[PDB]
Design a protein around this ligand. Structure first.
Ligand SMILES: [Mg+2]
Ligand SMILES: [Mg+2]
Ligand SMILES: [Mg+2]
Ligand SMILES: [Zn+2]
Lengths: 38, 361, 68
RNA sequence: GCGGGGUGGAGCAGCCUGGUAGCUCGUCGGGCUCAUAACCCGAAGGUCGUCGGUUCAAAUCCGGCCCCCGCAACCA
RNA sequence: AGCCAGGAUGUUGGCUUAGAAGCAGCCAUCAUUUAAAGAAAGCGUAAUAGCUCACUGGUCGAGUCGGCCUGCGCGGAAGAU
């Protein structure tokens, strides 16, 4: 999990999802791409 | 025609010399063994081993394929030369001459690489000549060696300058430092390092006795200037604290003394002379920079001192080239190359010895 | 059929011809030679018109670096 | 912060007061000597730290920049 | 959007490289088979391979795309009784 202020799609499989008032990037291909805004 | 045949024979001998210096049978067997190992599946089980075997195969393949193609080209050029001479074909003769020139340049590139495999062989060099056991005769001999090396550099087309010189009071020079600039100057001159023994009736002896004098030549490459590296601030730890013997409320309270520690090295500097923490930090940074530079300087001095201790003394038993003028013989102890034209050698015909030393490697 | 690149090299009489093609031409070939090359590989080549094979081989040579 | 300096290879002058570079050693050539030193007779070598300004004209006067020196840096 | 087919050839374009096959680069970057198939956009292989994908066909049957101006909100946002 990368927790940072600037969360972005890093590959074509990354998806932006807002869970519980938090912007998150979940990737079905690369676990390194998992991101949380914070 | 006959010069072309002589050239072909010289190239054949050079190719055989390359094959034997490289032990072409040994290299070919090693290449075959590497091929067998690489065909085996288990070879790639260790990626580092597989990559090392691949690079070794590439180098051995370069050498082996180059020689296998070279031999065939020489045989073909011999056949085409025979046909051209028989048929009196000037165009085919010129084409064969061009092919022989190209093949000679190719084999010469291989010869050049083998001659200068060293890392710094391409760089410019410095030559230092120092007189030794002969005394005044040694200083005169040193001057003779200086003249010889300058003439040889002129013959090779290199550019020479005299950085420093100390002349003997009676005659000759005590020492001289010369800068040589050119293509592969260090490679061409590096084999002349050592002590040169001279045997001739000393002109500085009233009885004209046959004395022996020694002079030392030392050749070292021109080192590139080091790039200055700024201290990476992530490599430093800075501590601020109260200075010792602090007098007064202000000084007792304030953190003015600064200590800087270099994490990679462990060297520490510290300054507390000034009232200002900023001034103390600047002075401590300057001292830390100076100490790192001094550490590098100590390393450089240690390398130089090891070289000075490695340098053989300029005296009996340290000769690698004997110039005996009474017997009119000059002999290199390392290679065994011997000549009788002492005058030519003193005038700068060092190519025989230098090429012999490089071929011996 | 044997590969086209080695045949192109054999026709050229050159060994290395790819470094910096447009900046300076290393080799060059003629169209008739290319066509003659093309006709011999007709069994495996995917085409009926030999002209198409010829221009494909020309394009291959151009990619290699040699200007037709 | 306040003062000084930087000129043939070395050490010193010339700056003040603009026009002009000197001394001693050192280097080079010729002598003397069997030879070296010493000695004797001749020569050469600095466009003045680095830029800029001012001036008809700058080693010189002014201003930066670099190096070197001194002092000062306190009550705290 | 999914979903089903496909998603070719010269050709691994050559060099430099240790190897370099679309996918280290350099370096050209074309024509052919045509519905379309990049001398490859990504993943991936030591390299291939392999996995996609761009492209295109076929079933389902109304929207879909992503910029511009603007209002209000969201994250970024840790301190000591
Ligand atoms: Mg006090
Ligand atoms: Mg003047
Ligand atoms: Mg806000
Ligand atoms: Zn992703």
């Amino acid at each position: 999990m990368k927790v940072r202020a600037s969360v972005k799609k890093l590959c074509r499989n990354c998806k932006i999802v807002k869970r519980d008032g938090v912007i998150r990037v979940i990737c079905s291909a690369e676990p390194k791409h998992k991101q949380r805004q914070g | 025609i006959n010069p072309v045949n002589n050239r072909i024979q010289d190239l054949t001998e050079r190719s055989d010399v390359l094959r034997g210096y490289l032990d072409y049978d040994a290299k070919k067997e090693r290449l075959e063994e590497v091929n067998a190992e690489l065909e085996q599946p288990d070879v790639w089980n260790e990626p580092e081993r597989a990559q090392a075997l691949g690079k070794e195969r590439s180098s051995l393949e370069a050498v082996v394929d180059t020689l296998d193609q070279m031999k065939q080209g020489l045989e073909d050029v011999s056949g085409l030369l025979e046909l051209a001479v028989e048929a009196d074909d000037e165009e085919t003769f010129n084409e064969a001459v061009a092919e022989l020139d190209a093949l000679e340049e190719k084999l010469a590139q291989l010869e050049f690489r083998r001659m200068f495999s060293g890392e710094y062989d391409s760089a410019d060099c410095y030559l230092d000549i120092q007189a030794g056991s002969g005394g005044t005769e040694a200083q005169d001999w040193a001057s003779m060696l200086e003249r010889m090396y300058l003439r040889w550099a002129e013959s090779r087309g290199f550019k020479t300058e005299i950085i420093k010189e100390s002349e003997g009071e009676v005659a000759g020079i005590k020492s001289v430092t010369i800068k040589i600039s050119g293509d592969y100057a260090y490679g061409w001159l590096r084999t002349e390092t050592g002590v040169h023994r001279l045997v001739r009736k000393s002109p500085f002896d009233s009885g004209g006795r046959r004395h022996t004098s020694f002079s030392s030549a030392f050749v070292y490459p021109e080192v590139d200037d080091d790039i200055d590296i700024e201290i990476n601030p992530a490599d430093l730890r800075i501590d601020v604290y109260r200075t010792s013997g602090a007098g007064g409320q202000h000084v007792n309270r304030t953190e003015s003394a600064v200590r800087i520690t270099h994490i990679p090295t462990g060297i520490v500097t510290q300054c507390q002379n000034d009232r200002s923490q900023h001034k103390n930090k600047d002075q401590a940074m300057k001292q830390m920079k100076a100490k790192l530079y001094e550490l590098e300087m100590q390393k450089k001095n240690a390398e130089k001192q090891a070289m000075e201790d490695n340098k053989s003394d300029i005296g009996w038993g340290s000769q690698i080239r004997s110039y005996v003028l009474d017997d009119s013989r000059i002999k290199d102890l390392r290679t065994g190359v011997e000549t009788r034209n002492t005058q030519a050698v003193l005038d700068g015909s060092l190519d025989q010895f230098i090429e012999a030393s490089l071929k011996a490697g | 059929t044997p590969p086209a690149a080695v045949l192109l090299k054999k026709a050229a009489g050159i060994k290395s011809g790819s470094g910096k093609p447009n900046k300076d031409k290393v080799g060059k070939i003629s169209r008739a030679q290319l066509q003659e090359i093309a006709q011999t590989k007709a069994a495996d080549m995917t085409g009926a018109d030999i002209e198409a094979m010829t221009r494909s081989i020309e394009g291959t040579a151009r990619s290699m670096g040699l200007v037709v």
